[PDB]
Amino acid sequence: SMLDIALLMANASQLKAVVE
Amino acid sequence: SMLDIALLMANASQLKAVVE
Amino acid sequence: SMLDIALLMANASQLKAVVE
Amino acid sequence: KSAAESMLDIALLMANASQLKAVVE
Amino acid sequence: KSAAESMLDIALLMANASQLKAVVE
Amino acid sequence: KSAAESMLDIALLMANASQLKAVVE
Amino acid sequence: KSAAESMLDIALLMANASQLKAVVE
Amino acid sequence: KSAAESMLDIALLMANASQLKAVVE
Amino acid sequence: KSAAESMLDIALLMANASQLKAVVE
Amino acid sequence: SMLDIALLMANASQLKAVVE
Amino acid sequence: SMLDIALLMANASQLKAVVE
Amino acid sequence: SMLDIALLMANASQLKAVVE
Numbered sequence: 001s002m003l004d005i006a007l008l009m010a011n012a013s014q015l016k017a018v019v020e
Numbered sequence: 021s022m023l024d025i026a027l028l029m030a031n032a033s034q035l036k037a038v039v040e
Numbered sequence: 041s042m043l044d045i046a047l048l049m050a051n052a053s054q055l056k057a058v059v060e
Numbered sequence: 061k062s063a064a065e066s067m068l069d070i071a072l073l074m075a076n077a078s079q080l081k082a083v084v085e
Numbered sequence: 086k087s088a089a090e091s092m093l094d095i096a097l098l099m100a101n102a103s104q105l106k107a108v109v110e
Numbered sequence: 111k112s113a114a115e116s117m118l119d120i121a122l123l124m125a126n127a128s129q130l131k132a133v134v135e
Numbered sequence: 136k137s138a139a140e141s142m143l144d145i146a147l148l149m150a151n152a153s154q155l156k157a158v159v160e
Numbered sequence: 161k162s163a164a165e166s167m168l169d170i171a172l173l174m175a176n177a178s179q180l181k182a183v184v185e
Numbered sequence: 186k187s188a189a190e191s192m193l194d195i196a197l198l199m200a201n202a203s204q205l206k207a208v209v210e
Numbered sequence: 211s212m213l214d215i216a217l218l219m220a221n222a223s224q225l226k227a228v229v230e
Numbered sequence: 231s232m233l234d235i236a237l238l239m240a241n242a243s244q245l246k247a248v249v250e
Numbered sequence: 251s252m253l254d255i256a257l258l259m260a261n262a263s264q265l266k267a268v269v270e
Contacts, residue, residue, distance in 0.1 A: 024046065
């Protein structure tokens with residue numbers, strides 16, 4: 001007997017600007 | 021007996037700007 | 041006996057701008 | 061000039077009603 | 086000039102009603 | 111000039127009603 | 136028993152770029 | 161027993177870029 | 186027993202960039 | 211000159227339960 | 231000259247339970 | 251010249267329970 005309700009959300013934002 | 025409701029969401033945004 | 045309801049969503053946005 | 065406008069979304073709606081009646085004599 | 090405008094979202098709604106009746110004699 | 115404006119969100123709503131009735135004689 | 140489970144959502148995404156160049160000599 | 165579970169949401173994302181160049185000689 | 190569980194939310198994200206260049210000679 | 215972007219969204223949920 | 235961006239959202243939930 | 255960005259959100263929940 002087991003009733004897991006495991007549930008996730010996630011975000012991400014990488015930004016590698018090499019502006020001269 | 022097991023009743024998992026595993027469920028995810030996800031986002032992502034890579035951005036490698038080499039603006040001169 | 042098992043009643044998984046595994047289910048996902050996902051997004052993505054790569055952007056490699058080399059604007060001069 | 062230039063431009064690049066992206067947009068994108070996801071929706072989800074559910075009414076799951078799982079049910080289990082494991083029985084052993 | 087330049088520009089790059091991105092936008093993106095996720096929604097989710099649920100009414101899960103899991104139920105278990107494990108019984109052993 | 112340049113610009114890079116990103117935006118992104120996630121929503122979630124739930125009404126889980128798990129229930130278990132483990133019984134052993 | 137009884138039950139009445141309702142759920143409903145709205146999404147919206149925009150990139151409006153209005154622009155006006157009113158000129159009078 | 162009885163039950164009445166309601167849920168409802170709204171999302172919105174924008175990148176408005178209004179611009180005006182009123183000029184009079 | 187009875188029950189009435191309501192839930193509801195609103196999101197909003199913006200990148201407004203209004204701009205005005207009123208000029209009179 | 212006018213550039214309205216008027217725009218709406220709306221929800222509603224009436225519920226008149228007379229459960230005895 | 232005018233650049234309105236008027237825009238709304240709205241929710242509502244009436245509930246008149248007369249449970250006895 | 252005018253650049254209004256008027257914009258609203260709103261919620262509501264009436265509940266008139268006459269439970270006996």
